[PDB]
């Protein structure tokens, strides 16, 4: 009942690498994933794969828990962890079959990890010029939106560029929470735009198109028949007693909307449905009524202006209301939306509205937009850029093998295997593009031998050659490559450190 | 269903041999441990033979009779229970005379009961008198059980506890010298303190705590009162119940409850007492009229514990609370005290004499240490009881077994008849006690047992025993491995009384 | 069935089975084990105590050895998985002579003879060095490097050495309850350090609060300033919703009269400039009461613990107060820098630079959940090893130098009870050499290569020899700074003789029925 007992901890992580190796790159394949609520979904993002695939082996859960740390401090390269650290554990199995101990590979990996953190600042070619221009920003964002939505990057690189420039004067406060995404059904991606302030997809149900009131109250309860918090035994016998309750319901709701006018609040948000007679009372006292059925659309407004959602039927409470500058309506893309604009304030809220005919298609654009904001959320720190497309993966594999050859002793075996694990990432890019991977690696090492740096893969099915990444405009993030190498090495050293797994009762 | 014939005569043999084979290797100071497997996965590694068979369920009627005859033997004397079940399994183990010779058991019982008379006659010939007045000779008897224990640090003080307890219970005026440790020497455990704090007082201690400061703290002349009736609401001759749910019933019951208790409490405070002792319980309202006279409330005492209080002070047991008189006085007692010991209150009615009763007060640093001394002292009290019952020792460690088996061989040469063949089998069955001592030591058993019989033939039979420490033969007059006579007298008597009971069974039938 | 010696052969296979499992996690070069709770809880440890107490085994005989390591940590706190590796080889080497016809009681009589000679040998190799800063680093280095992947082995030594040195003065006994262990997320694993003051879970939540107070008078409070019941003989009666608004103002007036009393005590005692005032109230505080105190410069803290309030009594010096009606200045304390530490999500109040707190809080930071529990079990094993070095001033050389020196001392030793006890000191000498044997397999070297070199090293002087974790050469433990405790090695030889006796002293196993 025991065969190897050290190989089964690695084979569980090799299956986790295979679910994202073919899904790597701009030529990567999509995944037909099934939601837990029985919903069909088509995506190719690496973070949405692990969220739905409930992996159960705890040896492969270390790389998944490393992906949750990969989502922190950087929003770039979750697929880089599942490919590179998967190639670390696959190449480490060739050393253990010879007779090498597992503790010798551990100290040899941490030696080559600190050596790879010194060669990576030497490969920084360009940097951002901090001009806050749409030509400088969209030139670097065109590589990050690639490998998410290929072919439609010409419309996505300009829209997120117009959102992040409006936040860059607010220095030290740029984040992904300031740029929100609201999806509106429409024609396609060509009709999409970008707006300022908080934009919701639902229009104002009332007849007010513009109001300058600051007091905003949110009530999650729908507009229906009022129920007393006490017992409240209400009995009806005849038709005249039913009309006394029907007219008395409208008369009490007339005093309910009058309490909103007494506190000086002309903006009300209702989570549930609104009755037709209660909608007439809101338009009488010039009150803007916006219906928001989504709970995440209601929770977004409490964390911005402070207006809380109360369960009671319109309570006149002055303490739990929010504050905004100007709430109005705007007609963009043949659809009226509500804008929570900040006129007196300088403003740091931007909303990118996305249009599309398929909800399964518009959700993949939302993961491509939030990964585009997270590329420049990293660039609020020290600006360093590295060439992409497998350009840095060969030069880092060239210097480590040159370093491990000159170093004598038993530690030269784990350093040489640390460089060949970087070769799997151009092997993942060449295989997904329909090109023989053994020819591109030989074409990459032949041009890097002569000193022609910044050379990556030519993205073409018919051309197995290479091209320059500096003239092509392909650039990655150095901090995106810095935390990816450190977290994948710390994850792959954790799986090799654990030998056997024993179940225990609580 | 049912079984009769010669199969139950062999079926009861293997039922007793299976019990004897379990605890055969648990004899002597080198007793091997035994591992018990629980259904919940628990494991106890106790080597005590009384603890092994208690936690093992049996299904045979002969094997069930084997455990209870040693359990009653454990209540009589506190030592020698393992040697009973070993000897009872060895006497029935030679089944060649029971089945192959086609002998009726009546021939065997006539040979076994005739060999029982040679058990008592041989042990009185190898005996030795004991100078019980010297305390140094009493220390060399009880020390065989104090070794490898946590009480062994205080062996000079723990030996004074058990020796003073057995002498107060033993009454030389009655002639038969009765000792009963369960009643007149009731041991109680008190947490707190150390092992050196534990001493012996001449009285009875009450473990009831003090709930109110309006009590007697220090009284030089304690006026004690004993009562059997209850102190509660008056019940009738029927079996009706008391349920208070209405406000009209709450007033009528409590007015009858107060008027009867005040009528009862007026009869006891007219004699000006110091502590009240009732057999049944005392209600909460009964202490309200009792605290005005500053009397210590003691309740919930058994009838067996009540006579120890009456023999301590000299009071009169009064059945009803309306029938108190002036003769119910406790004149002559030492002191009444409710002083706390380690934040527990204890009542003292001790005296400076021997009022046919005593108690043992134990102290220790933790409650596990309290349970360690009480299981060692009670094992030590029953061994020293048998010395004061009859001041005679026997050479233990297998020396008495080879001396008895040597006398049976020369007696069998003059015993004619058919019964001489099972008569010689008892002599070889009594050799199993020095046989397992050499096997537990690890030496060669047959090489040592053959030279053991050669020393018992030519030399004196009172010497040349077995030492269960080194594995060789030593003289029993040099080392203190002496066993009491009354333990070895009841050991061979019970092993015959077990063999006379299992061999006489010839049918096992069912029926309720 | 099977009324024979087969009850001993099944128990030694559980000892050989538990030896081959726990041999891969000794020393820093060893591997780790995973503890899956079945629901999803993942924990990585090398500690043999949690590997036997928390880990559940199916064998009943191996469950007894799990109860051995639970008794090991109560007296020493170290050497639980080293307890298993000796008794695994003790019952393995016993089987070479039991199958030849020897009784197990004879080998038990030889094991107690080898225990008294090895305990006398421990008195000669011990070094009574004066306890200072440098020698406690080497003791902390031998303990903390076996729970760390060698990136926190340098930072965690000065956190545990300076903590126990700050509480070791005036010949007082070391108390581990003076050390408070706190855990916080959203930080790196190397960001851990020592804190002079305490760490409170909930701080002041008000925009008008002071971010740092350099000097303040701390008033100990335990009064609930929230919506409480009536202290005067009254009741809760109301006719409508408007009567509740009158009742809530008649009920809360019992609260704000006490809040303004703290301002009157602040202005009376040290009401001038260059002063401060912190409230350490454990119970809940009214949010309206937070605006009343923050305008005059009072930082109010709420939602504290019961054990933290006793540490606040020793830090500041204020007596625990139960009612605000008898406020008096003797319940006031003093502290230095009282500021708030900002995290990514929460904020924590730090009250360091105290007068005489007699309590040091260790601040352990970690990015993951299972990373926090690993260092928390590492700091408790590391602090108990240095506590064994201060109370017991004599230390022993590490790296298995004692066990190789005890193997030569037990060879040149004749038994004085019998001649058949010669195998008792023979098997005890071979089973003690499993620690240089298992340190070769975890380091990746040959087992018999470094065993020859560690045994051939002899001289005409006092010299100790140990194994090398890097090169496999003979290495002196005194020259590199590898040291263990004398109290741990004294309990190691004492507990190994007892447990290997009880497995050797069984002959039959029976199914009990409660
Ligand atoms: N068109 C391209 N040209 C050059 N390099 C590319 C191209 N597409 C992807 N890459 C390379 O792929 C790696 C990142 O690719 P990818 O966009 O798949 O990661 P990602 O999907 O952003 O990670 P995450 O799953 O966290 O979003 C980089 O090393 C980059 O050099
Ligand atoms: N060193 C020794 N060598 C040989 N025999 C000894 C030695 N020490 C004591 N004995 C004998 O062993 C006897 C104890 O045997 P065993 O364990 O079978 O009975 P026990 O369990 O003590 O009886 P009980 O259950 O009534 O206490 C003692 O009566 C004593 O005479
Ligand atoms: N740097 C080192 N080089 C060589 N040997 C070492 C080193 N550090 C410690 N050791 C040895 O490792 C042994 C302790 O091993 P380890 O710390 O893995 O178990 P442990 O935690 O002591 O077990 P337990 O938790 O049961 O106390 C010590 O006896 C010591 O001799």
PDB file of C-alpha atoms in Angstrom, chain B residues 211-325:
ATOM      1  CA  UNK B 211     -22.716  27.624  56.144  1.00  0.00           C
ATOM      2  CA  UNK B 212     -23.295  30.247  58.866  1.00  0.00           C
ATOM      3  CA  UNK B 213     -21.009  31.844  61.493  1.00  0.00           C
ATOM      4  CA  UNK B 214     -23.694  31.516  64.219  1.00  0.00           C
ATOM      5  CA  UNK B 215     -22.335  28.195  65.461  1.00  0.00           C
ATOM      6  CA  UNK B 216     -20.227  26.784  68.275  1.00  0.00           C
ATOM      7  CA  UNK B 217     -16.527  27.320  67.570  1.00  0.00           C
ATOM      8  CA  UNK B 218     -14.741  26.023  70.690  1.00  0.00           C
ATOM      9  CA  UNK B 219     -16.684  24.173  73.394  1.00  0.00           C
ATOM     10  CA  UNK B 220     -14.836  22.389  76.199  1.00  0.00           C
ATOM     11  CA  UNK B 221     -17.899  20.435  77.434  1.00  0.00           C
ATOM     12  CA  UNK B 222     -19.806  19.372  74.303  1.00  0.00           C
ATOM     13  CA  UNK B 223     -23.492  18.631  74.902  1.00  0.00           C
ATOM     14  CA  UNK B 224     -24.403  16.272  72.056  1.00  0.00           C
ATOM     15  CA  UNK B 225     -27.898  15.152  70.990  1.00  0.00           C
ATOM     16  CA  UNK B 226     -28.888  12.313  68.646  1.00  0.00           C
ATOM     17  CA  UNK B 227     -32.257  12.034  66.909  1.00  0.00           C
ATOM     18  CA  UNK B 228     -33.784   9.676  64.341  1.00  0.00           C
ATOM     19  CA  UNK B 229     -36.925  11.518  63.214  1.00  0.00           C
ATOM     20  CA  UNK B 230     -36.974  13.998  60.335  1.00  0.00           C
ATOM     21  CA  UNK B 231     -37.055  17.805  60.535  1.00  0.00           C
ATOM     22  CA  UNK B 232     -39.485  18.740  57.749  1.00  0.00           C
ATOM     23  CA  UNK B 233     -43.193  19.064  56.971  1.00  0.00           C
ATOM     24  CA  UNK B 234     -45.531  16.559  58.617  1.00  0.00           C
ATOM     25  CA  UNK B 235     -46.534  13.784  56.219  1.00  0.00           C
ATOM     26  CA  UNK B 236     -49.475  11.440  56.718  1.00  0.00           C
ATOM     27  CA  UNK B 237     -49.811   7.677  56.547  1.00  0.00           C
ATOM     28  CA  UNK B 238     -50.696   7.865  52.839  1.00  0.00           C
ATOM     29  CA  UNK B 239     -48.382   8.346  49.852  1.00  0.00           C
ATOM     30  CA  UNK B 240     -49.512  11.845  48.843  1.00  0.00           C
ATOM     31  CA  UNK B 241     -47.106  14.376  47.337  1.00  0.00           C
ATOM     32  CA  UNK B 242     -46.318  18.004  48.174  1.00  0.00           C
ATOM     33  CA  UNK B 243     -46.743  20.540  45.361  1.00  0.00           C
ATOM     34  CA  UNK B 244     -46.857  24.299  45.983  1.00  0.00           C
ATOM     35  CA  UNK B 245     -48.295  26.116  42.954  1.00  0.00           C
ATOM     36  CA  UNK B 246     -50.988  28.450  44.365  1.00  0.00           C
ATOM     37  CA  UNK B 247     -50.566  31.470  46.634  1.00  0.00           C
ATOM     38  CA  UNK B 248     -53.350  30.192  48.901  1.00  0.00           C
ATOM     39  CA  UNK B 249     -51.524  26.875  49.288  1.00  0.00           C
ATOM     40  CA  UNK B 250     -48.194  28.647  49.874  1.00  0.00           C
ATOM     41  CA  UNK B 251     -49.473  30.400  53.005  1.00  0.00           C
ATOM     42  CA  UNK B 252     -51.244  27.423  54.609  1.00  0.00           C
ATOM     43  CA  UNK B 253     -48.305  25.046  54.106  1.00  0.00           C
ATOM     44  CA  UNK B 254     -45.638  27.446  55.409  1.00  0.00           C
ATOM     45  CA  UNK B 255     -47.692  28.324  58.498  1.00  0.00           C
ATOM     46  CA  UNK B 256     -47.975  24.621  59.343  1.00  0.00           C
ATOM     47  CA  UNK B 257     -44.280  24.177  58.490  1.00  0.00           C
ATOM     48  CA  UNK B 258     -43.187  26.942  60.880  1.00  0.00           C
ATOM     49  CA  UNK B 259     -45.476  25.937  63.756  1.00  0.00           C
ATOM     50  CA  UNK B 260     -44.369  22.290  63.778  1.00  0.00           C
ATOM     51  CA  UNK B 261     -40.635  23.038  63.513  1.00  0.00           C
ATOM     52  CA  UNK B 262     -40.733  25.689  66.266  1.00  0.00           C
ATOM     53  CA  UNK B 263     -42.550  23.115  68.402  1.00  0.00           C
ATOM     54  CA  UNK B 264     -39.769  20.634  67.581  1.00  0.00           C
ATOM     55  CA  UNK B 265     -36.908  23.095  68.079  1.00  0.00           C
ATOM     56  CA  UNK B 266     -38.213  24.203  71.486  1.00  0.00           C
ATOM     57  CA  UNK B 267     -37.587  20.734  72.930  1.00  0.00           C
ATOM     58  CA  UNK B 268     -33.901  20.581  71.976  1.00  0.00           C
ATOM     59  CA  UNK B 269     -32.864  24.102  73.012  1.00  0.00           C
ATOM     60  CA  UNK B 270     -34.381  23.706  76.486  1.00  0.00           C
ATOM     61  CA  UNK B 271     -31.405  21.485  77.378  1.00  0.00           C
ATOM     62  CA  UNK B 272     -28.944  24.138  76.007  1.00  0.00           C
ATOM     63  CA  UNK B 273     -27.032  21.944  73.520  1.00  0.00           C
ATOM     64  CA  UNK B 274     -23.965  22.671  71.401  1.00  0.00           C
ATOM     65  CA  UNK B 275     -24.368  20.532  68.258  1.00  0.00           C
ATOM     66  CA  UNK B 276     -27.475  18.843  66.831  1.00  0.00           C
ATOM     67  CA  UNK B 277     -27.257  15.618  64.805  1.00  0.00           C
ATOM     68  CA  UNK B 278     -30.352  14.420  62.940  1.00  0.00           C
ATOM     69  CA  UNK B 279     -30.638  11.199  60.947  1.00  0.00           C
ATOM     70  CA  UNK B 280     -32.729  12.675  58.129  1.00  0.00           C
ATOM     71  CA  UNK B 281     -32.311  16.032  56.405  1.00  0.00           C
ATOM     72  CA  UNK B 282     -32.711  19.495  57.904  1.00  0.00           C
ATOM     73  CA  UNK B 283     -34.799  22.037  56.007  1.00  0.00           C
ATOM     74  CA  UNK B 284     -33.848  25.673  55.455  1.00  0.00           C
ATOM     75  CA  UNK B 285     -36.504  27.029  57.821  1.00  0.00           C
ATOM     76  CA  UNK B 286     -35.393  24.599  60.549  1.00  0.00           C
ATOM     77  CA  UNK B 287     -32.017  26.364  60.684  1.00  0.00           C
ATOM     78  CA  UNK B 288     -33.708  29.742  61.221  1.00  0.00           C
ATOM     79  CA  UNK B 289     -34.884  28.863  64.731  1.00  0.00           C
ATOM     80  CA  UNK B 290     -31.659  26.924  65.306  1.00  0.00           C
ATOM     81  CA  UNK B 291     -29.279  29.805  64.530  1.00  0.00           C
ATOM     82  CA  UNK B 292     -30.824  31.917  67.303  1.00  0.00           C
ATOM     83  CA  UNK B 293     -29.418  29.464  69.867  1.00  0.00           C
ATOM     84  CA  UNK B 294     -26.018  29.199  68.056  1.00  0.00           C
ATOM     85  CA  UNK B 295     -26.060  25.444  67.420  1.00  0.00           C
ATOM     86  CA  UNK B 296     -23.943  23.629  64.837  1.00  0.00           C
ATOM     87  CA  UNK B 297     -26.194  21.944  62.257  1.00  0.00           C
ATOM     88  CA  UNK B 298     -25.150  18.401  61.288  1.00  0.00           C
ATOM     89  CA  UNK B 299     -27.485  16.442  59.006  1.00  0.00           C
ATOM     90  CA  UNK B 300     -27.617  13.430  56.652  1.00  0.00           C
ATOM     91  CA  UNK B 301     -25.846  10.803  58.765  1.00  0.00           C
ATOM     92  CA  UNK B 302     -26.417   7.062  58.359  1.00  0.00           C
ATOM     93  CA  UNK B 303     -27.625   4.707  61.081  1.00  0.00           C
ATOM     94  CA  UNK B 304     -24.269   2.898  61.043  1.00  0.00           C
ATOM     95  CA  UNK B 305     -22.405   6.177  61.577  1.00  0.00           C
ATOM     96  CA  UNK B 306     -24.868   7.121  64.336  1.00  0.00           C
ATOM     97  CA  UNK B 307     -23.768   4.412  66.784  1.00  0.00           C
ATOM     98  CA  UNK B 308     -20.138   5.523  66.450  1.00  0.00           C
ATOM     99  CA  UNK B 309     -21.228   8.957  67.687  1.00  0.00           C
ATOM    100  CA  UNK B 310     -23.190   7.435  70.586  1.00  0.00           C
ATOM    101  CA  UNK B 311     -20.211   5.326  71.669  1.00  0.00           C
ATOM    102  CA  UNK B 312     -17.910   8.362  71.448  1.00  0.00           C
ATOM    103  CA  UNK B 313     -19.715  10.582  73.974  1.00  0.00           C
ATOM    104  CA  UNK B 314     -22.245   8.351  75.740  1.00  0.00           C
ATOM    105  CA  UNK B 315     -25.514   9.877  74.531  1.00  0.00           C
ATOM    106  CA  UNK B 316     -28.939   8.275  74.141  1.00  0.00           C
ATOM    107  CA  UNK B 317     -30.545   7.581  70.762  1.00  0.00           C
ATOM    108  CA  UNK B 318     -33.934   9.316  70.892  1.00  0.00           C
ATOM    109  CA  UNK B 319     -36.532   8.336  68.307  1.00  0.00           C
ATOM    110  CA  UNK B 320     -38.809  11.390  68.366  1.00  0.00           C
ATOM    111  CA  UNK B 321     -38.009  15.088  68.839  1.00  0.00           C
ATOM    112  CA  UNK B 322     -40.884  15.593  71.297  1.00  0.00           C
ATOM    113  CA  UNK B 323     -39.425  12.941  73.638  1.00  0.00           C
ATOM    114  CA  UNK B 324     -36.121  14.559  74.647  1.00  0.00           C
ATOM    115  CA  UNK B 325     -34.931  14.269  78.248  1.00  0.00           C
TER     116      UNK B 325
END
